[PDB]
Amino acid sequence: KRDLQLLRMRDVVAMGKQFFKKDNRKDFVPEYCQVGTIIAGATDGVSGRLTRKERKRTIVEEVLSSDSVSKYKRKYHEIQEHKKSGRKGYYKKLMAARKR
Amino acid sequence: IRRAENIPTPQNPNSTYRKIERPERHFNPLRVPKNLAAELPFKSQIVQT
Amino acid sequence: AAERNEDEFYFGMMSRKGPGSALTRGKGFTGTVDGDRGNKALSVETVRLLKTQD
Amino acid sequence: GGVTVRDVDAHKFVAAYAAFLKRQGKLPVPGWVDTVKTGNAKELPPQDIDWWYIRAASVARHVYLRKTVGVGRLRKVHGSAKNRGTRPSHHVDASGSVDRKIMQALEKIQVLEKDEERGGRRITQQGQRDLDRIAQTVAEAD
Amino acid sequence: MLRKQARQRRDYLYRRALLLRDAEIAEKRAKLRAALASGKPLDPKIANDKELRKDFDYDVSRDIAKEQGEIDIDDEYSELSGIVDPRVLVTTSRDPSSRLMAFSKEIRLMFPTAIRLNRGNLILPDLVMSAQRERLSDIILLHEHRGTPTAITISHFPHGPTLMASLHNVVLRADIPKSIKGTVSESYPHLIFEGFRTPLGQRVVKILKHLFPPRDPTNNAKSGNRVITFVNQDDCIEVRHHVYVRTNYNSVELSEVGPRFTMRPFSITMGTLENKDADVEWHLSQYTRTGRKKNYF
Amino acid sequence: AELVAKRAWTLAGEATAADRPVNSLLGEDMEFDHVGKPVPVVTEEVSES
RNA sequence: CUGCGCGCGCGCUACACUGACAGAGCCAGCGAGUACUCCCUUGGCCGAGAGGCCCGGGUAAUCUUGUUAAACUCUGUCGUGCUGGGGAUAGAGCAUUGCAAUUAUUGCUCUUCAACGAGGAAU
């Protein structure tokens, strides 16, 4: 289920460097799936091959082991500031400045 | 006159334009009174866990 | 609330707790009909199973 | 039979407890007792003169009958109407020095305790023990 | 009883909405009847509607009856117009003063069939409840500022309109001495209305002249010795209450017997005094741009 | 000296109650908008009519 | 003191013993309440009081608030005396609101302790 949520959010994962076909059904889980692994292209084996410290178990573990997790955290904190912009801590501060 | 007899031009800091930081206005939810919320009928009764 | 039939009868009234009054409910009286959180009173055999697991 | 203080009427209980806290001789009394008023909403000081025991007994029972109470609730409870002379009556809170010092006195005597877990002051387990015991004593005079 | 009042008010509102749609159709049907009698050619959108002709053949006769005035419009007053004597009680605000209670007595004596009620501790929904329980036609509430009245609230029952008005220039009956005034005659008063021309003016004329009992129409043009005058200028209806003798066939001596107002209405609501959420019909539009230029009534 | 001196409170556009003297509005002749209809006072010609 | 045309009107508080005071009992209902903010505020200390202070729950049948409101009920003190009825006027002090409190915003303390002994004719 985490892997399927990641597959429907793979536009967000590559942060604008690579956009994807907007397939948005109501249920992201298909009826028939099978989690497999790329084996080997015999023509390319020096850089088209994940190493032992990068062959992880799930897809979300590969996304987290990749870079730009700080980029996700930066975008999340910008969204959090924009959504805490004027909601209720702002009004608590206004009420305290009036009462002082 | 001001440059000759050495008096600065009058400038009000409350009058000089500034940038205004507006937080996004979020309002409180609806606060239904207890007597009305206990008197209104079953199909429209408020369900709060 | 003004145009309410005092003799209305839905069948959810046999599976819901009404808003009551301040006298019947008490200090914890809001006009909202209380809903279920999903918990349920759990029989002894299943709690025997859960406590063996714990 | 078994007993609480809820099985004993207000005045004969609070008077029995007043006579007990008085007899005991352990109590703290601040010292500004006698020379003090109870509230800004009053005209004269109390007429019992030594009377801090009456409020101590009244406070301690009030706390026994419920979860937790703070100084603010007691000031509000023990306050009444002030005549503003020729302008309408209004309710006015009583003094928080009286009640807070009573609470601290009765805390040091181990008949109530702080309840920072929720706020205020809760009845002590030894406060339940002594209050239920004098409540029994009151019914044993009758 | 209460279920009947609610049901009849809902039926009245539904019938009024159906009358709006039927008036939108019957403005088209009156062109077809006038073109049939006079032969002037009419619009094709009117002459080529088969439903309109097919229903026009049944609904001629109510249009003819409305042209002759043989029927009366669906109204809250047309049910009991000149059949029942409208009973009406006058009440104060909650803790009245002595001049407000004497003023309440004076405007009770203005109506020959009114009664006055002491408020005391009387909750306003139970006041409405007791009015519908005793089949009163009208209630009139009074509000004072400091021994001088500042508002009337004329509410028609069972579900009729409120007219809330503010009073100005009130000269009480209770200021002049008993040597000069006296006991007011209680005869059925003539009424005159001067300056009401809009349909809103005819609305307020209806809800003011259905407060008084109906006059016997056999010889009313010469008999009766007491008149009540509602005349408006600048939509502030000013009311006098006179008593008269006809000292000749060409002259008449008036004598001011009652209080003088210039009440200005500020709210006419299609719903009784309890309903604060009733749909208003008109309200005094202050704080608009041309609300002081435009004159209603 | 008049051009360099401070503007009067009538020539400043926003005159709050701290600037001017106490009853200084009574000496001025300003026009302003009113709101709503005034009530017509009953005069003797009105009562006669 | 509004309003109407030292004079006037609506009022508040009293002249006490069906009371004042002091303890003590202890009971409502209609309300309201803080976002781009300082609203309704419990409890903990400090303070005689007014208040201060540290936290805290609430955009609310959820927290204030059971709004423990007042007359009221009881056990006392006072004893008909302008008396402890009454609390005007006045001095001195401490606080809170507010940029500002003098012509005293309001709050508390001490003191000062006026008229008023049921209102007349009338209405």
Residue A6: Cβ within 10 Å count: 17
3-state secondary structure of D3: coil
Distance between CA atoms of residues E291 and F37, nearest Å? 8
Distance between CA atoms of residues E276 and E128, nearest Å? 13
Within chain A, residue ranges assigned H as helices are 2-8, 10-13, 60-65, 69-83, 89-99
Structure-token match 């508002």, residue found: E151
Structure-token match 């009401």, residue found: E196
Distance between CA atoms of residues D30 and D100, nearest Å? 11
Where in chain C does DSSP place strands (E)? none
E35 is written with which tokens?
């073109």
Structure-token match 């604008």, residue found: A16
Chains B and C touch (3+ CB pairs under 8 A): yes
How do strand E236-245 and strand E261-269 relate by DSSP bridges? antiparallel
- Would you give the distance in Å from CA F36 to the centre of its chain? 18
Cβ atoms of residues E77 and E206 within 8 Å: yes
Cβ atoms of residues E152 and E141 within 8 Å: yes
Measured CA to CA in angstroms, residue E48 lies from E28, E32, E36, E43, E78 at distances of: 12, 11, 14, 9, 37
Which residues are CB-neighbours of E254 under 8 A, at least 6 positions away?
E242, E243, E244
Task: Please report how the helices D52-64 and D71-78 are oriented relative to each other, as an axis angle in degrees rounded to 10.
Answer: 120
Q: In residues, how long is chain B? A: 49
Structure-token match 């009015």, residue found: E131
Could you tell me the distance in Å between the CA of residue D39 and the C1' of nucleotide G103? 33
- E256 to chain C, closest Cα gap in Å: 46
- F3 to chain B, closest Cα gap in Å: 10
Distance between CA atoms of residues E160 and E155, nearest Å? 7
| Category of D38 on φ-ψ map: left (φ > 0), alpha (ψ -120 to 50) or beta | left
C7 vs E: CB within 8 A: no
- B32 to chain C, closest Cα gap in Å: 8
Q: How was this structure determined?
A: cryo-EM
Cβ atoms of residues A69 and A76 within 8 Å: no
Question: Mutating which of F3, F4, F11 best tests the B interface, going by the most B Cβ atoms within 10 A?
Answer: F4
Cβ atoms of residues E205 and F8 within 8 Å: no
Instruction: Tell if the CB–CB gap between A88 and B24 is shorter than 8 Å.
Output: no
User: SS3 letters for D26-80?
Assistant: CCCCCCCCCCCCCCCCCCCCCCCCCCHHHHHHHHHHHHHCCCCECHHHHHHHHCE
Structure-token match 């009244």, residue found: D58
D56 is written with which tokens?
């101590």
Greatest CA span in chain B, whole angstroms? 84
Burial class (CB in 10 A: 0-12, 13-18, 19+), D104: middle
Out of C12, C30, C35, the one facing B34 most closely (by C-beta) is C30
B20 is written with which tokens?
């205004």
Full DSSP string of chain F: -TTTSPPPTTTSS---TTTS-TTTTTT--------SPPPPP--HHHHH-
Cβ atoms of residues D53 and D9 within 8 Å: no
CB contacts of F35 in chain E (<8 Å) are: 286-287, 292
Strand partners, E155: E139, E162
Distance between CA atoms of residues A93 and E293, nearest Å? 46
CB contacts of B21 in chain A (<8 Å) are: none
Q: Please report, as a single letter, which amino acid is at residue D49.
A: I
User: SS3 letters for chain E?
Assistant: CHHHHHHHHHHHHHHHHHHHHHHHHHHHHHHHHHHHHHCCCCCHHHHCCHHHHHHHCCCCHHHHHHHHCCCCCCCCCCCCCCCCCCCEEEECCCCCCHHHHHHHHHHHHHCCCEEECCCCCCCHHHHHHHHHHCCCCEEEEEEECCCCEEEEEEEECCCCCEEEEECCCCECHHHCCCCCCCCCCCCCCEEEEECCCCHHHHHHHHHHHCCCCCCCCCCCCCCCCEEEEEEEECCEEEEEEEEEECCCCCCCEEEECCCEEEEEEEEEECCCCCCCCCCEEEECCCCCCCCCCCCCC
Cβ atoms of residues F42 and E169 within 8 Å: yes
Residue D46's nearest nucleotide, by CA–C1', is G22
Out of B33, B37, B43, the one facing C19 most closely (by C-beta) is B37
E151 is written with which tokens?
């508002």
How do strand E253-256 and strand E236-245 relate by DSSP bridges? antiparallel
Q: Please report, as a single letter, which amino acid is at residue D10.
A: A
E124 is written with which tokens?
């306003």
Structure-token match 């203005």, residue found: E110
Backbone angles phi, psi at C31, to 5 degrees: -70, -10
Measured CA to CA in angstroms, residue E110 lies from A61, A83, E93, E209, E239 at distances of: 91, 66, 19, 13, 11
Distance between CA atoms of residues D120 and D59, nearest Å? 13
C1 vs E: CB within 8 A: no
Give the torsion sign (CA, F30, F35, F41, F46).
positive
Cis peptide before E158 (omega within 30 of 0): yes
Structure-token match 């007053």, residue found: E77
Of D38, D33, D28, D37, residue with least CA distance to D102? D28
